[PDB]
Design a protein around this ligand. Sequence first.
Ligand SMILES: *[C@@H]1O[C@H](CO)[C@@H](O[C@H]2O[C@H](CO)[C@@H](O[C@H]3O[C@H](CO)[C@@H](O)[C@H](O)[C@@H]3O)[C@H](O)[C@H]2NC(C)=O)[C@H](O)[C@H]1NC(C)=O
Length: 361
Amino acid sequence: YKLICYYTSWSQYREGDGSCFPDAIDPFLCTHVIYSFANISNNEIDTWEWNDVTLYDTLNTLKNRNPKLKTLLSVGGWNFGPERFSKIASKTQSRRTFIKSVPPFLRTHGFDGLDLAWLYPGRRDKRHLTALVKEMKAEFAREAQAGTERLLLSAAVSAGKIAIDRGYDIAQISRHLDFISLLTYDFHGAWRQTVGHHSPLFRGNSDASSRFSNADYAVSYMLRLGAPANKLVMGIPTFGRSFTLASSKTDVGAPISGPGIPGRFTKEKGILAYYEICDFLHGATTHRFRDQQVPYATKGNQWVAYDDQESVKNKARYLKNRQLAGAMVWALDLDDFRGTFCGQNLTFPLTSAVKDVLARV
Ligand SMILES: *[C@@H]1O[C@H](CO)[C@@H](O[C@H]2O[C@H](CO)[C@@H](O[C@H]3O[C@H](CO)[C@@H](O)[C@H](O)[C@@H]3O)[C@H](O)[C@H]2NC(C)=O)[C@H](O)[C@H]1NC(C)=O
């Protein structure tokens, strides 16, 4: 069982305790840690924050306390134009230049692999996406000839039926990717105004349309398109999505006027870190969609959908019963990394819960 964990580079800037560096990571918690978002310039992989070289180095030293740890660097992300990616993949000339530029870069900074986070391929990208992966892996097999351990190659994929049908050739890229991470937590549309859970586990007996929006369906679909169970990694949120109610209605279906208010440390509308949700929970009413098996809390005119220890152990068991390769946790830095915000003196509550379940059988 794999436990891929993402560490986001821009979490250093957060004020107070909110600040997180490679430093705070438990060497023995995850199996793969993915440093989040490198850039591309002149069709060549490159750093993003000025001190990426120092943090790169800082993270890669964890491999000194734990030999078996493996780290990878991710390319793209949400603040990286889709188009920008799409331009590089279409022109074989500019694509080969990018591919040729990765090995070196990783070997120098100490990573054991690359992670592609092209955030959403369009109908016109599917063919090139397949080209990019295919060729990139060929490059990695060829470079292992130099007598060093072959670099890994993976990818962050959407879990939206429509998104997959539109831009991914799952059967084709499944064979060159070392492992695939399903973004099973972006389900409730950024578009419409209705309270809903972004990462539901199950269909949920009460609501006909868009059953395609839950981890279970996303997973069953990928297996059908051709992805091997031994390459799928299911995504698990370590954050919550907030909304500002537009009425005293709190139950499934209630009106919304927009995202929720900012977090004191997170400072971003609509999102809250797990440690912020821990402080928010005080004096809030909790609820739990029994059909989907996922939380939600309300307080004042704020309605928050999130994941606790139990909702997370649940997804972990599911993951196991379908025999998937493992779990993926988005943001170690959104988890209670210090462990001084959520009751129990434990550190990394959620990611640990996933790990305990994974080490069972
Ligand atoms: C990831 O890589 C991007 C592509 O290289 C970087 O971008 C830009 O490259 C230049 C420089 O900023 C931009 O054009 C600017 O350059 C000069 C400064 O010499 C300015 O005078 C001019 O006004 C422009 O700002 C381009 O806009 C841009 N290329 C694009 C956007 O297509 C980008 O900085 C980098 N991202 C980060 C955070 O490193």
